[PDB]
């Protein structure tokens with residue numbers, strides 16, 4: 001009914017909670033001291049006990065994770081109604097902030113390298129049988145060539161969807177969802193029962209690949225309902241309007257494939273990215 | 278475009294405009310919830326409707342928002358809601374507008390069973406001329422016509438609100454709320470070029486919903502149509518794009534009304550009736566020359 005932070009391999013004596021790092025739909029993310037750390041405080045309503053019973057299992061799954069491209073999960077303590085997820089602190093900037101900065105230059109070679117790093121981390125998480133299901137440029141950090149993935153698996157227990165018969169969509173969420181997920185969305189759909197898969201995470205990476213070159217999300221102009229229909233029927237943009245070669249456009253064609261089984265695995269995707277100019 | 282009684286109160290509105298000056302939060306006392314709130318202004322005796330939209334962004338960007346929002350001080354029409362001012366308080370932008378004691382058309386449709394054809398005629402005329410005013414006088418389209426954005430009052434006038442006057446506010450929106458009722462035109466769902474024709478579709482779909490008392494997509498079966506007299510979001514949107522548009526029952530409504538909504542719900546926006554063609558349609562010529570006490574219907578219907 002509780003998880004102690006003395007159950008963790010990271011030896012824990014004291015934890016200092018600092019300032020808030022930023023605004024976020026899922027809990028509050030504060031600075032921390034352990035070395036500096038990132039503490040995410042969450043509240044559980046003390047209902048769906050069996051769902052948080054699975055939250056504990058998913059957290060213990062994080063314990064077996066360690067990879068240079070995946071944020072170091074360091075511990076988690078649960079004294080209901082309060083939970084806390086403690087991960088290593090990422091210095092640098094989110095890929096969201098980097099991609100939208102005028103001074104930062106993003107040639108084709110660095111975008112190939114940034115993508116390969118995210119693929120390597122996701123390939124590890126898939127090999128360990130872990131689905132990230134909320135891959136965005138706000139959950140990838142970039143510090144002068146160091147690329148780390150963040151917030152994997154949180155979306156299942158997130159509760160970011162919660163009006164009466166009206167589902168909440170944030171700006172960049174829809175364009176990362178594969179068509180099989182988009183066709184499921186409903187005002188009373190919940191994050192725990194959405195058909196996520198390894199193919200859906202590959203689709204989310206395809207969105208990031210578009211974001212790396214266009215340096216903006218796909219379907220930027222259009223409202224949420226138009227995005228839902230266009231993505232559900234399989235309409236997807238390309239990168240030719242900015243002069244990107246076929247090599248860089250084939251990445252999207254494979255990752256954004258309408259049928260799940262046509263999307264490559266991350267190992268195969270790593271091969272594909274190796275063969276770019 | 279012309280009337281004297283409508284000019285009588287619109288200039289009196291501009292007499293009440295003098296003491297609005299500038300606005301800040303402490304001027305207001307929360308009266309009730311209608312997110313919008315009915316509020317009591319104390320620097321001037323006006324009771325107002327102040328709408329709060331929660332957005333966080335750098336100062337210069339929302340200053341660009343206010344520059345774009347102050348255009349509403351310029352647009353004045355008996356068919357669009359009047360504008361007081363827009364300030365930024367507590368990280369939530371406020372838009373101060375007329376309080377219309379009748380509410381929106383969706384909650385009065387929730388109050389009534391169905392809305393009769395004669396009232397919907399006057400509603401059609403005012404929405405057409407309101408959109409006409411915006412497009413011809415300010416080069417803007419509404420972009421969000423639906424029953425929840427058409428307001429009524431006990432004086433008897435109806436006005437359009439929540440129309441798109443600012444461009445940066447579109448992008449500045451942090452998120453959006455997508456439910457089971459969608460009023461977006463097919464052409465906008467498919468991401469093609471769109472004009473006021475999309476607002477005409479939204480008007481037509483709003484009219485049929487208010488006429489029958491139910492959101493008309495998907496169409497009801499035979500048993501539900503007699504009694505009147507679990508679907509994902511993508512299934513609805515794909516029904517709007519590919520399946521034939523909704524239509525009124527042929528028994529209880531006049532031909533002029535049925536043809537009017539049919540011309541508004543043509544999928545092809547080039548064939549869809551425009552504001553000018555609607556101004557000539559037989560349905561609104563007939564409705565314009567009718568004696569209907571709209572205030573009497575409202576006050577007796579809502580109570």
Ligand SMILES: Nc1ncnc2c1ncn2[C@@H]1O[C@H](COP(=O)(O)OP(=O)(O)NP(=O)(O)O)[C@@H](O)[C@H]1O
Pocket residue numbers: 021022023024025026027029038071087088089090091094138139150151170
């Ligand atoms: N390890 C970390 N190092 C540095 N910043 C972090 C770290 N983890 C989270 N943050 C920041 O904390 C803030 C909130 O993060 P989060 O709750 O994940 O929301 P988000 O993913 O950025 N956007 P959203 O998905 O809509 O909630 C953001 O500014 C993140 O960049």
Ligand SMILES: Nc1ncnc2c1ncn2[C@@H]1O[C@H](COP(=O)(O)OP(=O)(O)NP(=O)(O)O)[C@@H](O)[C@H]1O
Pocket residue numbers: 311312313326358374375376377378380381384425426428438439454
């Ligand atoms: N000037 C007004 N006078 C009276 N009621 C108003 C006025 N403006 C808004 N309202 C009320 O405010 C409610 C909410 O407004 P709004 O923010 O547009 O949400 P909504 O129209 O109901 N649905 P949505 O527009 O998709 O968020 C409406 O249902 C009206 O009842």
Ligand SMILES: Cn1cnc2c(F)c(Nc3ccc(Br)cc3Cl)c(C(=O)NOCCO)cc21
Pocket residue numbers: 312328330346349357358359360372374437438439440441442443444446447
């Ligand atoms: C995108 N966008 C650009 N400009 C806008 C604008 F002015 C708006 N409001 C408005 C306009 C005129 C009058 Br008169 C009264 C109102 Cl309340 C809205 C709006 O009401 N969004 O509601 C979103 C859901 O909460 C949106 C705008």
